[PDB]
Design a protein around this motif. Sequence first.
Motif, PDB file in Angstrom:
ATOM      1  N   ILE A  31       0.819  -1.203   0.000  1.00 11.06           N
ATOM      2  CA  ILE A  31       0.000   0.000   0.000  1.00 11.06           C
ATOM      3  C   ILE A  31       0.857   1.260   0.000  1.00 11.06           C
ATOM      4  O   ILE A  31       0.382   2.322  -0.421  1.00 11.06           O
ATOM      5  CB  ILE A  31      -0.969  -0.005   1.197  1.00 11.06           C
ATOM      6  CG1 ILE A  31      -2.057   1.051   1.014  1.00 11.06           C
ATOM      7  CG2 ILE A  31      -0.227   0.233   2.493  1.00 11.06           C
ATOM      8  CD1 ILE A  31      -2.889   0.857  -0.235  1.00 11.06           C
ATOM      9  N   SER A  40       2.619   2.575  10.506  1.00 12.89           N
ATOM     10  CA  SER A  40       1.931   3.572  11.310  1.00 12.89           C
ATOM     11  C   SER A  40       0.433   3.608  11.074  1.00 12.89           C
ATOM     12  O   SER A  40      -0.294   4.170  11.901  1.00 12.89           O
ATOM     13  CB  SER A  40       2.504   4.962  11.038  1.00 12.89           C
ATOM     14  OG  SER A  40       1.574   5.964  11.400  1.00 12.89           O
ATOM     15  N   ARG A  41      -0.053   3.028   9.984  1.00 13.71           N
ATOM     16  CA  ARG A  41      -1.471   3.094   9.661  1.00 13.71           C
ATOM     17  C   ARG A  41      -2.018   1.726   9.290  1.00 13.71           C
ATOM     18  O   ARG A  41      -2.856   1.595   8.395  1.00 13.71           O
ATOM     19  CB  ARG A  41      -1.728   4.112   8.553  1.00 13.71           C
ATOM     20  CG  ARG A  41      -1.076   3.811   7.222  1.00 13.71           C
ATOM     21  CD  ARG A  41      -1.290   4.970   6.268  1.00 13.71           C
ATOM     22  NE  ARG A  41      -0.982   4.616   4.890  1.00 13.71           N
ATOM     23  CZ  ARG A  41      -1.833   4.011   4.072  1.00 13.71           C
ATOM     24  NH1 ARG A  41      -3.044   3.684   4.499  1.00 13.71           N
ATOM     25  NH2 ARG A  41      -1.475   3.728   2.829  1.00 13.71           N
ATOM     26  N   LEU A  42      -1.577   0.686   9.992  1.00  6.56           N
ATOM     27  CA  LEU A  42      -2.144  -0.643   9.816  1.00  6.56           C
ATOM     28  C   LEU A  42      -1.956  -1.444  11.096  1.00  6.56           C
ATOM     29  O   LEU A  42      -1.085  -1.146  11.916  1.00  6.56           O
ATOM     30  CB  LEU A  42      -1.511  -1.379   8.631  1.00  6.56           C
ATOM     31  CG  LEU A  42      -2.185  -1.223   7.271  1.00  6.56           C
ATOM     32  CD1 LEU A  42      -1.577  -2.173   6.261  1.00  6.56           C
ATOM     33  CD2 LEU A  42      -3.677  -1.454   7.392  1.00  6.56           C
ATOM     34  N   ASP A  43      -2.793  -2.467  11.257  1.00  3.70           N
ATOM     35  CA  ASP A  43      -2.646  -3.407  12.355  1.00  3.70           C
ATOM     36  C   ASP A  43      -1.587  -4.448  12.012  1.00  3.70           C
ATOM     37  O   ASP A  43      -1.307  -4.696  10.838  1.00  3.70           O
ATOM     38  CB  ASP A  43      -3.975  -4.099  12.649  1.00  3.70           C
ATOM     39  CG  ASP A  43      -4.931  -3.227  13.436  1.00  3.70           C
ATOM     40  OD1 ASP A  43      -4.756  -3.110  14.668  1.00  3.70           O
ATOM     41  OD2 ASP A  43      -5.877  -2.683  12.831  1.00  3.70           O
ATOM     42  N   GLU A  46      -2.215  -7.160   9.162  1.00  4.71           N
ATOM     43  CA  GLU A  46      -2.122  -6.769   7.758  1.00  4.71           C
ATOM     44  C   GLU A  46      -0.833  -6.032   7.426  1.00  4.71           C
ATOM     45  O   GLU A  46      -0.330  -6.149   6.296  1.00  4.71           O
ATOM     46  CB  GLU A  46      -3.316  -5.895   7.361  1.00  4.71           C
ATOM     47  CG  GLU A  46      -4.679  -6.476   7.712  1.00  4.71           C
ATOM     48  CD  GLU A  46      -5.044  -6.296   9.171  1.00  4.71           C
ATOM     49  OE1 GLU A  46      -6.142  -6.737   9.571  1.00  4.71           O
ATOM     50  OE2 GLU A  46      -4.231  -5.714   9.918  1.00  4.71           O
TER      51      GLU A  46
ATOM     52  N   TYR B  22     -15.412   5.833  17.984  1.00  7.59           N
ATOM     53  CA  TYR B  22     -15.221   4.391  17.895  1.00  7.59           C
ATOM     54  C   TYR B  22     -15.570   3.706  19.213  1.00  7.59           C
ATOM     55  O   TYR B  22     -16.122   2.600  19.219  1.00  7.59           O
ATOM     56  CB  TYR B  22     -13.779   4.092  17.487  1.00  7.59           C
ATOM     57  CG  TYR B  22     -13.429   2.624  17.447  1.00  7.59           C
ATOM     58  CD1 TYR B  22     -14.303   1.691  16.905  1.00  7.59           C
ATOM     59  CD2 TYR B  22     -12.217   2.172  17.947  1.00  7.59           C
ATOM     60  CE1 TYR B  22     -13.982   0.348  16.871  1.00  7.59           C
ATOM     61  CE2 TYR B  22     -11.886   0.834  17.915  1.00  7.59           C
ATOM     62  CZ  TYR B  22     -12.770  -0.075  17.375  1.00  7.59           C
ATOM     63  OH  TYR B  22     -12.438  -1.409  17.344  1.00  7.59           O
ATOM     64  N   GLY B  34      -7.560  -0.413   4.807  1.00  5.65           N
ATOM     65  CA  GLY B  34      -6.338   0.297   4.509  1.00  5.65           C
ATOM     66  C   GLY B  34      -5.825   1.164   5.633  1.00  5.65           C
ATOM     67  O   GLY B  34      -4.720   1.709   5.520  1.00  5.65           O
ATOM     68  N   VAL B  35      -6.590   1.311   6.710  1.00  6.16           N
ATOM     69  CA  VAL B  35      -6.185   2.079   7.879  1.00  6.16           C
ATOM     70  C   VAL B  35      -6.675   1.343   9.115  1.00  6.16           C
ATOM     71  O   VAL B  35      -7.800   0.834   9.142  1.00  6.16           O
ATOM     72  CB  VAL B  35      -6.744   3.516   7.845  1.00  6.16           C
ATOM     73  CG1 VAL B  35      -6.486   4.210   9.160  1.00  6.16           C
ATOM     74  CG2 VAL B  35      -6.122   4.308   6.710  1.00  6.16           C
ATOM     75  N   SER B  36      -5.834   1.281  10.130  1.00  8.46           N
ATOM     76  CA  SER B  36      -6.190   0.585  11.358  1.00  8.46           C
ATOM     77  C   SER B  36      -7.051   1.484  12.238  1.00  8.46           C
ATOM     78  O   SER B  36      -6.739   2.669  12.391  1.00  8.46           O
ATOM     79  CB  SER B  36      -4.942   0.173  12.116  1.00  8.46           C
ATOM     80  OG  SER B  36      -4.531   1.217  12.972  1.00  8.46           O
ATOM     81  N   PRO B  37      -8.133   0.964  12.819  1.00  7.44           N
ATOM     82  CA  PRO B  37      -8.990   1.823  13.654  1.00  7.44           C
ATOM     83  C   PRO B  37      -8.285   2.380  14.876  1.00  7.44           C
ATOM     84  O   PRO B  37      -8.472   3.555  15.210  1.00  7.44           O
ATOM     85  CB  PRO B  37     -10.139   0.883  14.046  1.00  7.44           C
ATOM     86  CG  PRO B  37     -10.147  -0.167  12.985  1.00  7.44           C
ATOM     87  CD  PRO B  37      -8.708  -0.378  12.639  1.00  7.44           C
ATOM     88  N   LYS B  39      -5.115   3.069  15.468  1.00  8.62           N
ATOM     89  CA  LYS B  39      -4.112   4.077  15.154  1.00  8.62           C
ATOM     90  C   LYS B  39      -4.676   5.232  14.338  1.00  8.62           C
ATOM     91  O   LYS B  39      -3.906   6.075  13.871  1.00  8.62           O
ATOM     92  CB  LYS B  39      -2.938   3.439  14.409  1.00  8.62           C
ATOM     93  CG  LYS B  39      -2.432   2.150  15.043  1.00  8.62           C
ATOM     94  CD  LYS B  39      -1.068   1.747  14.504  1.00  8.62           C
ATOM     95  CE  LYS B  39       0.044   2.556  15.137  1.00  8.62           C
ATOM     96  NZ  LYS B  39       1.376   1.956  14.855  1.00  8.62           N
ATOM     97  N   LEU B  43      -2.715   9.380  13.044  1.00  8.93           N
ATOM     98  CA  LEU B  43      -2.482   9.802  11.671  1.00  8.93           C
ATOM     99  C   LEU B  43      -2.936  11.239  11.441  1.00  8.93           C
ATOM    100  O   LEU B  43      -3.802  11.765  12.142  1.00  8.93           O
ATOM    101  CB  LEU B  43      -3.213   8.872  10.706  1.00  8.93           C
ATOM    102  CG  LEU B  43      -3.143   7.395  11.075  1.00  8.93           C
ATOM    103  CD1 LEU B  43      -3.911   6.555  10.082  1.00  8.93           C
ATOM    104  CD2 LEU B  43      -1.694   6.946  11.131  1.00  8.93           C
TER     105      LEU B  43
END
Lengths: 49, 50, 46
Positions: A31, A40-43, A46, B22, B34-37, B39, B43
Amino acid sequence: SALGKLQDVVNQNAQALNTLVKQLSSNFGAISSVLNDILSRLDPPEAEV
Amino acid sequence: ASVYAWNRKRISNCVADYSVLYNSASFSTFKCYGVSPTKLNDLCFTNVYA
Amino acid sequence: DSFVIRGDEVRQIAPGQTGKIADYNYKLPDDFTGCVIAWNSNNLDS
């Protein structure tokens, strides 16, 4: 430009190193190419893939 | 709004706390792709579209 | 592991799954889990 061979080997090594450094901009299907973003923007589940 | 005329609102120039909304259990399904809740708070984004 | 949970929350009890009850109280570790068996018995509840 008599010293053709020497300059050839210098240019070849510099070219190899430059393309190796450039290969860091590739996504390779991710991505984002940079690692700190996809960290920084995923768990972890993934971000792992 | 109706589904075919879905209503879009631009969101910018604000400090947005995703964590509180949330945390509320009013929302039945919360899927972020595409984005973790968790975190989401850390961002920073150019703008949001709702 | 034995417990009774509302049926709506049964999806939350999965490896790496996220839910308020799941994340806060009981969440499967983000790796191998043997098996999860769920049969809703709301009649016995309440």
